[PDB]
Amino acid sequence: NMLLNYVPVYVMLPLGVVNVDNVFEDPDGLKEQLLQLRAAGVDGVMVDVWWGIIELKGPKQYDWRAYRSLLQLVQECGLTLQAIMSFHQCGGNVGDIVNIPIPQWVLDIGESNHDIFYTNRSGTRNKEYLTVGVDNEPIFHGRTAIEIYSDYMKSFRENMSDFLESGLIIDIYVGLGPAGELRYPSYPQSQGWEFPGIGEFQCYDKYLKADFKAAVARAGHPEWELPDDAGKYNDVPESTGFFKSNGTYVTEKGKFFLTWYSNKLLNHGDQILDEANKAFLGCKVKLAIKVSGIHWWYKVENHAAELTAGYYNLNDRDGYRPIARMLSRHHAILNFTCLEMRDSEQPSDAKSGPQELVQQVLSGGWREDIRVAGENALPRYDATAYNQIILNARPQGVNNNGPPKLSMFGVTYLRLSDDLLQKSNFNIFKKFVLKMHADQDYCANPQKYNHAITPLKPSAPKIPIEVLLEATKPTLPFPWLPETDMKVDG
Ligand SMILES: OC[C@H]1O[C@H](O[C@H]2[C@H](O)[C@@H](O)[C@@H](O)O[C@@H]2CO)[C@H](O)[C@@H](O)[C@@H]1O
Numbered sequence: 001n002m003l004l005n006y007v008p009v010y011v012m013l014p015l016g017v018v019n020v021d022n023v024f025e026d027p028d029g030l031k032e033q034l035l036q037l038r039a040a041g042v043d044g045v046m047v048d049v050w051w052g053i054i055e056l057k058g059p060k061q062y063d064w065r066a067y068r069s070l071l072q073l074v075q076e077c078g079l080t081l082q083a084i085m086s087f088h089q090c091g092g093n094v095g096d097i098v099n100i101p102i103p104q105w106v107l108d109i110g111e112s113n114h115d116i117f118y119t120n121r122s123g124t125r126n127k128e129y130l131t132v133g134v135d136n137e138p139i140f141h142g143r144t145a146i147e148i149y150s151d152y153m154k155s156f157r158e159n160m161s162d163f164l165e166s167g168l169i170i171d172i173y174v175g176l177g178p179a180g181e182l183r184y185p186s187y188p189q190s191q192g193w194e195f196p197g198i199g200e201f202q203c204y205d206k207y208l209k210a211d212f213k214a215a216v217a218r219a220g221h222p223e224w225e226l227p228d229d230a231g232k233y234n235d236v237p238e239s240t241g242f243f244k245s246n247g248t249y250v251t252e253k254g255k256f257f258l259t260w261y262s263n264k265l266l267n268h269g270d271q272i273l274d275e276a277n278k279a280f281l282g283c284k285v286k287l288a289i290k291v292s293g294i295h296w297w298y299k300v301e302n303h304a305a306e307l308t309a310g311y312y313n314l315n316d317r318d319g320y321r322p323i324a325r326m327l328s329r330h331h332a333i334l335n336f337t338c339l340e341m342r343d344s345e346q347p348s349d350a351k352s353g354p355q356e357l358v359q360q361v362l363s364g365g366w367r368e369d370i371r372v373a374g375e376n377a378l379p380r381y382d383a384t385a386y387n388q389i390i391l392n393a394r395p396q397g398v399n400n401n402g403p404p405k406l407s408m409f410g411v412t413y414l415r416l417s418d419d420l421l422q423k424s425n426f427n428i429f430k431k432f433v434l435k436m437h438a439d440q441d442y443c444a445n446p447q448k449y450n451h452a453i454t455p456l457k458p459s460a461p462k463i464p465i466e467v468l469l470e471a472t473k474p475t476l477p478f479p480w481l482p483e484t485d486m487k488v489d490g
Pocket residue numbers: 012015047048084086088089090091093094095096179180181290292293337375376377378
């Protein structure tokens with residue numbers, strides 16, 4: 001039955017639906033919009049549950065009232081919800097039309113200790129997320145950064161217990177860094193970065209620097225220092241000593257640093273996921289994380305931008321599959337982006353390979369037998385964008401003899417806006433939803449299309465770093481169709 005080819009579609013709610021004062025501003029307005037999504041066949045919506053709004057007053061001073069009102073409305077409108085534990089700031093990234101900082105009380109500690117923030121070689125502190133360096137430093141009024149995240153999720157679980165039991169919440173996305181993605185803030189627009197700048201390493205806070213120096217000393221090279229020839233945010237790889245041909249990134253020193261740098265992200269995600277699993281144990285929800293799609297410079301040997309962001313991915317080293325393997329122990333979903341981009345749409349001088357990047361990441365996930373979901377990176381309303389998303393959703397097309405051999409677990413569309421609801425744009429969107437659903441009507445019971453959600457089980461045993469890194473072995477991607485068999489048209 002075709003229903004087995006059904007891929008659910010979710011829509012991101014506007015940023016700031018609940019303002020910085022913790023007030024659900026326009027319920028009536030959101031309601032009319034939600035009802036239109038409901039009529040369009042959309043399966044659910046995604047929303048940021050901002051840490052900076054909820055635990056604003058002080059440590060463990062949570063106020064979940066406004067969000068309870070929002071969830072209640074979503075439920076009344078017949079939509080499911082993907083909730084993001086957003087431990088990051090809204091404001092300094094592309095599309096951030098509202099400013100939502102992390103809790104003021106955390107910012108206050110940052111005043112006396114600037115090293116709780118990601119820091120570049122120049123010493124500029126980025127305040128959008130707490131450096132992985134303090135994950136286990138008990139410097140936040142007695143708590144470590146991870147305990148803060150953990151306490152936040154448990155409070156969410158207990159205070160939204162009725163919504164979790166009623167099956168409103170389907171996925172719990174746990175923000176792991178800037179924009180909620182597991183990465184370093186290597187391309188900060190707030191610091192002048194401009195596409196396709198290679199970005200900068202963000203490991204100069206005293207905690208990360210100390211960890212690195214101890215590490216290299218244990219490796220027999222106490223003299224090794226953090227990168228000093230990697231250039232600046234807007235440089236090109238060839239103009240740097242680190243990324244140029246036969247450059248530093250290929251030396252023993254460089255490989256050690258890059259391994260160290262990327263390993264910090266894997267452990268960061270693994271430790272916080274452990275806490276998310278404990279917090280939601282038994283709940284009928286799946287855990288998920290977001291991996292950024294850094295497609296610029298993907299087509300040159302150095303993969304400069306990926307490296308500075310923390311994805312140690314080269315042509316002979318898979319920097320994403322180990323993330324997928326890590327997620328397997330947590331039975332989590334790998335959410336990737338750039339599902340809408342085509343290589344031809346990128347300036348030639350950016351050496352962009354979004355299509356090949358998507359193929360690599362999705363294949364790695366299916367290879368590790370984990371569920372893969374995704375979203376478009378930029379706002380798109382045209383058929384070509386939708387047709388590319390549909391292609392990636394079912395790379396080898398639909399199967400009439402049963403389920404597709406390859407299919408994404410779901411796709412979340414960025415983002416709900418008046419533009420999307422415009423007669424012509426919305427009309428195209430409705431076709432997009434229909435094709436994602438494999439020409440079937442909206443299906444309220446996920447069980448029908450093999451998406452039944454069982455109680456969250458405890459995470460499997462810890463996987464040692466050496467086993468995770470075995471996943472760096474390059475593999476050939478799964479075959480992709482040149483175009484989808486379920487086109488929207490134009
Ligand atoms: O509301 C979700 C999320 O949206 C924005 O981040 C997106 C980004 O715009 C996309 O280009 C891609 O990178 O995925 C990101 C994560 O979904 C906001 O910047 C972010 O704060 C917010 O959580």
